[PDB]
Design a binder for this molecule. Structure first.
Ligand SMILES: NC[C@@H]1CN(c2ncnc3[nH]c4cnccc4c23)CCO1
Length: 253
């Protein structure tokens, strides 16, 4: 019942996250502090999956969210700049990311800001999707609603979000998962944003894969990236088809 605030884990816009330890059980949890979030709590209440940060509850005093503590830090910190990480680790992380994203989409939730900073690791390096502050419902009563608000993080957002007034939620999270995979395999982000004024993005659309970061990436995972980082959201590979991808299914290590 009584928790000691041991240390700060991370900072956010509207607050900070602190590690809290139970005085009796010594259980660790993370506490997200927000000095007024209503939708974040609501969405968190729906979530129950092994690749999504668990929600234990909240107390209003300033709002306090009680969330799963992930001692392994963030995926961001397993990526060596300009190098990435070993391909078998990247594949395992990507499998776990798809599992989390499939779950969310299955309950009609889109995260909207998938990036390595938001993908946390537990003590066994299991990936956990965190931070549902930008998340929203895109399906309800089996009826899809198109999105129109721009949010997320420029290097990770899909090009339709910049160009179209309305867009489907799922292909946007698929795209950001592809940017995450690129980062894991090349240790660099391919562009500032996916717009026609961005030279690196133009190069990609013209298939200059002899340039970085694409030249650091083996042809198998690169063929999967060619299917994810497709400009037309309607032509973009879906998750069920990602699960059928050759590299996705390649035994590694
Ligand atoms: N960018 C990550 C860092 C450290 N971080 C975390 N660190 C450890 N465990 C956590 N569990 C969480 C549940 N929800 C949100 C965040 C965490 C969290 C907080 C954010 O800044």
């Amino acid at each position: 019942e009584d928790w000691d605030l041991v240390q700060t884990l991370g900072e956010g816009a509207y607050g900070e996250v602190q590690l809290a330890v139970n005085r009796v059980t010594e259980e660790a949890v993370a506490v997200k502090i927000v000095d007024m979030i209503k939708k974040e709590i609501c969405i968190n209440k729906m979530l129950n999956h092994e690749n999504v940060v668990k929600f234990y509850g909240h107390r209003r005093e300033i709002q306090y969210l009680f969330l799963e503590y992930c001692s392994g830090g963030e995926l961001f910190d397993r990526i060596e700049p300009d190098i990435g990480m070993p391909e078998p680790d990247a594949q395992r992380f990507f499998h776990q990311l798809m599992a989390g994203v499939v779950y969310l989409h299955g309950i009609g939730i889109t995260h909207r800001d998938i990036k390595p900073e938001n993908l946390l690791l537990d003590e066994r390096d299991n990936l956990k999707i965190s931070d549902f502050g930008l998340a929203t419902v895109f399906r309800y009563n089996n009826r899809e609603r198109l999105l129109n608000k721009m949010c997320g993080t420029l290097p990770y957002v899909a090009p339709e979000l910049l160009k179209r007034r309305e867009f489907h939620a799922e292909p946007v999270d698929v795209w950001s998962c592809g940017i995450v995979l690129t980062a894991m395999l090349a240790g660099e982000l391919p562009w500032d944003q996916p717009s026609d004024s961005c030279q690196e993005y133009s190069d990609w659309k013209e298939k200059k894969t002899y340039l970085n970061p694409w030249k650091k990436i083996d042809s198998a995972p690169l063929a999967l990236l060619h299917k994810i980082l497709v400009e037309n959201p309607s032509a973009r590979i879906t998750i069920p088809d990602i699960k059928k991808d050759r590299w996705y299914n390649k035994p590694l290590k």
